[PDB]
Amino acid sequence: VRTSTTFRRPKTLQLSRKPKYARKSVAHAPRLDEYKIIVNPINSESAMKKIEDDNTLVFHVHLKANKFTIKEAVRKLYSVEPVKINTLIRPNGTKKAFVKLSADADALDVANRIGFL
Amino acid sequence: KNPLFVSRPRSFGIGQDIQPKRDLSRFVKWPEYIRLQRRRKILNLRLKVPPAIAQFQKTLDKNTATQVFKLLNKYRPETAAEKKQRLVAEAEAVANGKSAQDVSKKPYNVKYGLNHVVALIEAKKAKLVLIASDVDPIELVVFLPALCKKMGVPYAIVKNKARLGTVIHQKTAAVLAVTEVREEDKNELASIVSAVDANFSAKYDESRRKWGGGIMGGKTQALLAKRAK
Amino acid sequence: LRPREFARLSHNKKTVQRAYGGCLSANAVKDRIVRAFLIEEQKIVKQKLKQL
Amino acid sequence: GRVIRAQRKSGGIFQAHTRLRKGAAQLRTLDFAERHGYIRGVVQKIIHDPGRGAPLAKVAFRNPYHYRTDVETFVATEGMYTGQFVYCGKNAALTVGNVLPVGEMPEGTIISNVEEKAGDRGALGRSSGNYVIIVGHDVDTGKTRVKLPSGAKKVVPSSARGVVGIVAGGGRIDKPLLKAGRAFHKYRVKRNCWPRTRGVAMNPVDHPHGGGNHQHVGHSTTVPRQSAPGQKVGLIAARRTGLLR
RNA sequence: GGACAUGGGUUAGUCGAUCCUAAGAGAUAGGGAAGCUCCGUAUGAAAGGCACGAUUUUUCGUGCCUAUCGAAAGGGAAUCCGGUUAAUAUUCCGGAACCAGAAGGUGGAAUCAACACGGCAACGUAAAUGAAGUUGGAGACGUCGGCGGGAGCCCUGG
RNA sequence: GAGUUCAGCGGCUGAAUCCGGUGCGCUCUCGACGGCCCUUGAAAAUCCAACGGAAGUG
RNA sequence: GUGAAUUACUUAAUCAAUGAAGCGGAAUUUCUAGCGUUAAAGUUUCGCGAACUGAUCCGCGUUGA
Numbered sequence A: 001v002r003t004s005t006t007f008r009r010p011k012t013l014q015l016s017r018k019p020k021y022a023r024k025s026v027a028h029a030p031r032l033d034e035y036k037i038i039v040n041p042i043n044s045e046s047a048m049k050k051i052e053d054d055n056t057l058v059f060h061v062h063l064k065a066n067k068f069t070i071k072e073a074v075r076k077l078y079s080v081e082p083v084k085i086n087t088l089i090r091p092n093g094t095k096k097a098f099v100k101l102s103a104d105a106d107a108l109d110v111a112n113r114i115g116f117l
Numbered sequence B: 001k002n003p004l005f006v007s008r009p010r011s012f013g014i015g016q017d018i019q020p021k022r023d024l025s026r027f028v029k030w031p032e033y034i035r036l037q038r039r040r041k042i043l044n045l046r047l048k049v050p051p052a053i054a055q056f057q058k059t060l061d062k063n064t065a066t067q068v069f070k071l072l073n074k075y076r077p078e079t080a081a082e083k084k085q086r087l088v089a090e091a092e093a094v095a096n097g098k099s100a101q102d103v104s105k106k107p108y109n110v111k112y113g114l115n116h117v118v119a120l121i122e123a124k125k126a127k128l129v130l131i132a133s134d135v136d137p138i139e140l141v142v143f144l145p146a147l148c149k150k151m152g153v154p155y156a157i158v159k160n161k162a163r164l165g166t167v168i169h170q171k172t173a174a175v176l177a178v179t180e181v182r183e184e185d186k187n188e189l190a191s192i193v194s195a196v197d198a199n200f201s202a203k204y205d206e207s208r209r210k211w212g213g214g215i216m217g218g219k220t221q222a223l224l225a226k227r228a229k
Numbered sequence C: 001l002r003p004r005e006f007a008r009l010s011h012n013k014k015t016v017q018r019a020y021g022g023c024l025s026a027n028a029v030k031d032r033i034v035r036a037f038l039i040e041e042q043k044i045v046k047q048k049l050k051q052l
Numbered sequence D: 001g002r003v004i005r006a007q008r009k010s011g012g013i014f015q016a017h018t019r020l021r022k023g024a025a026q027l028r029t030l031d032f033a034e035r036h037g038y039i040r041g042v043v044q045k046i047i048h049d050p051g052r053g054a055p056l057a058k059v060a061f062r063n064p065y066h067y068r069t070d071v072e073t074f075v076a077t078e079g080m081y082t083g084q085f086v087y088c089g090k091n092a093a094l095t096v097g098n099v100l101p102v103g104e105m106p107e108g109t110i111i112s113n114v115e116e117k118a119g120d121r122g123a124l125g126r127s128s129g130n131y132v133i134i135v136g137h138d139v140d141t142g143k144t145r146v147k148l149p150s151g152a153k154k155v156v157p158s159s160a161r162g163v164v165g166i167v168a169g170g171g172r173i174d175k176p177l178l179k180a181g182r183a184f185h186k187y188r189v190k191r192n193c194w195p196r197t198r199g200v201a202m203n204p205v206d207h208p209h210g211g212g213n214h215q216h217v218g219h220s221t222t223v224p225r226q227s228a229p230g231q232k233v234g235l236i237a238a239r240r241t242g243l244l245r
Numbered sequence E: 001g002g003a004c005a006u007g008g009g010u011u012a013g014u015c016g017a018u019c020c021u022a023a024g025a026g027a028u029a030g031g032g033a034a035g036c037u038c039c040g041u042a043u044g045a046a047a048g049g050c051a052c053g054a055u056u057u058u059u060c061g062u063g064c065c066u067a068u069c070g071a072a073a074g075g076g077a078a079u080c081c082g083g084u085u086a087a088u089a090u091u092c093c094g095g096a097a098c099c100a101g102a103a104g105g106u107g108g109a110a111u112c113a114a115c116a117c118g119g120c121a122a123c124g125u126a127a128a129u130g131a132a133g134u135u136g137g138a139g140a141c142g143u144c145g146g147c148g149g150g151a152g153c154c155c156u157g158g
Numbered sequence F: 001g002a003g004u005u006c007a008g009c010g011g012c013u014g015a016a017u018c019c020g021g022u023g024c025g026c027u028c029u030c031g032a033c034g035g036c037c038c039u040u041g042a043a044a045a046u047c048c049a050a051c052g053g054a055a056g057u058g
Numbered sequence G: 001g002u003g004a005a006u007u008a009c010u011u012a013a014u015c016a017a018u019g020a021a022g023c024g025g026a027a028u029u030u031c032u033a034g035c036g037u038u039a040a041a042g043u044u045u046c047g048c049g050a051a052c053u054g055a056u057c058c059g060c061g062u063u064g065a
Helices: A045-054 A067-078 A107-114 B032-046 B051-057 B062-073 B080-095 B114-122 B144-150 B161-167 B186-201 B218-228 C004-008 C026-051 D032-036 D180-188
Strands: A038-041 A056-061 A082-089 A095-101 B128-132 B155-158 B175-178 D038-047 D056-062 D069-075 D085-089 D099-101 D110-112 D132-138 D143-147 D153-157 D161-164
Touching (some): A038 A067, A045 A056, A045 A095, A056 A067, A056 A107, A067 A107, B062 B155, B062 B175, B062 B186, B128 B144, B128 B186, B144 B155, B144 B186, B155 B186, B161 B175, D032 D038, D032 D085, D056 D085
Antiparallel strands (some): A038 A056, A082 A095, B128 B175, D038 D056, D038 D085, D099 D161, D110 D132, D110 D161, D132 D143, D143 D153
């Protein structure tokens, strides 16, 4: 007994993939980790003034790092909590990140501890 | 009787309350494979079927079919597992040093397979032939009633190649042939043969000249009935 | 307001407390009510006429 | 030597400009309600359809099978107004605006948007001020003879429908356009068919008429019906030319 | 010196893109074509959902009805001021906001007359439940011509 | 407290930033209208509301 | 391709519509720009529980030329 003039195809059981082997012998290591995110800090005169004025570190950062991965990499590499991240792709095709540190920490001591001053 | 249970009848006339859900089966846009099945059945009902093909539309009756299948199920062939146990039992018998002939009795089973049954009919070794009515392509069995008639082999056209398959442990079987039965069932086969012969072989001459088909649909039949009236 | 700016308002600020309020004007609603009642009385009086 | 302007009219930039169209003007689909009874609709609004001389009516009908409202775009007839009820079907009254089968209407009635064959939803008598006249009936063969706006008489199935009355907007061609700008605007909202350059003003490569030291055709302008597409210019298969002096 | 050499320089939840669709491009279904590919865009397609139930012979029953791309001048969530640099800013700094989404919490209202009252009314209120289904509205629209109001500029009295 | 102007000190301290008129004025906008057309002047995403009444110490 | 004594038939193919919605048989809604859906009465079994009819059956060839 059909009350609709259309015939819709019935639903069938759709088994999920249960492979007999793994297509990859070993899963790849995380290809974008903290050390690959941060390449090296920028130490130009403009970068130094941002350190001493805006409490902002300036880093040469990987292209595929977003503001979230930059924040975690900085927190893991330097144990400092950033309050803001601003990124730009420099005319030479390299990402530069302005990492504004929290008011509790100063960029000067962080810079000396890194050693790039 | 609660007075609040007031009747609210719905009029379903043209322009009245919304039409109720009715059976719309005859108007459903069925899938193409469904339409192809049903319209193929209609062409076979409409078109003038040649007698060699139309003879397959008249099959064995229900009572004789049940009687035939009762006899057949006593002579189903050995299954794979039963063959394996019998084969192993013969192996230990040979290992024990016994004749392979006397260990196992002579088989008594239905003969199946189109080519094997055809050879049996041509050699007059088959005493009964059961031809499936729904073999596709039909040419695989169109010649069989004539071949059975020339060699005088009693033949019946039975429904459901699937039923023949279940007898011989397969899915479908084109034909079944009974060559030898035990003396207990010799009377039963003879009674079946007589009924099958009187039903099919005697009527073979008349059926060879009876073209099938020619049935028109209900709508045209009713329209022509009105014209005649 | 712009379409999405209607989503910030409260419920009573986007409608009017009346049947169809916020979808129809008051005069339109009044015509709906009187025409509904009058035609209903007709279908009753036509039914009473045709039932006998 | 090149294909002519007539041959390039196959599409492309000669398509109809349908950006502003207010819907295709069609009758209701011939359903059970409209075959065995009638169904009532309300004229929501009469609108102007760009590229068309006749106004269109947005008549809203109730769906007889489902809880929703069907809206049908009709060719408005003179006298149609917003809020008017339109009855479509076999038992519809013979009132201007209603839709009835031609077999249910007496001889001499004036109808429009007539179906050629029942179920195509309107073919004959649709331009503004045009109509079709019921000439006669043939019940034995179930056919109806009608007179078309061109005067040609045609036999249609008696179940074909037609809107009672004449199409609104009559007299549109009674007023001269007065200037090429009015012709320019009239034809923007239609195909690319204006302005029309004469073939005599073209070259031998551009047209059969073109060429010569004078603007003359050079051959008879009545061409056979059998001529090739590039040859079929002028008066095609003309049975009689000239004025009826 | 827009040359030459070495360095430095472009920071956005709010500005754009991204999202939307336009004309139009365009796979799939299908049909052509020796083919390259062509036609096609809800078409002659089984083109996908949703809710009920002590759990149903512990082998699932019962109802309910459209790709994608295509706009940095179209549609459209929400940011302003002051300042700062040799070069960046509605992006940085100082101050001051806003929008979208998420979660529970405080306070208030309604509630055992379950889903607030007032005004004749147009409607108002700090709240004032509303599934499916239907429908309406905003987005959403030409052009010219004066007339009225506002803001900024202009003019002007101390 | 900002910006601006001005007067002092060796970065700091004083003041002022006020009160009004006008218009066939320009620029943008807004409101109420008017005329024109065989020309009647996009879509969709998105957002809201309504009719209906499923459902329901807490 | 099927018939009948010149004509009929429709399954081949052609065409046209749709959301393939009510086809063929028998038994037996029109003074108004409103709303119309999520069945309720009736009849049996065990609270918007089930079941049957409300809404007849049959055929199935989506209908029309």
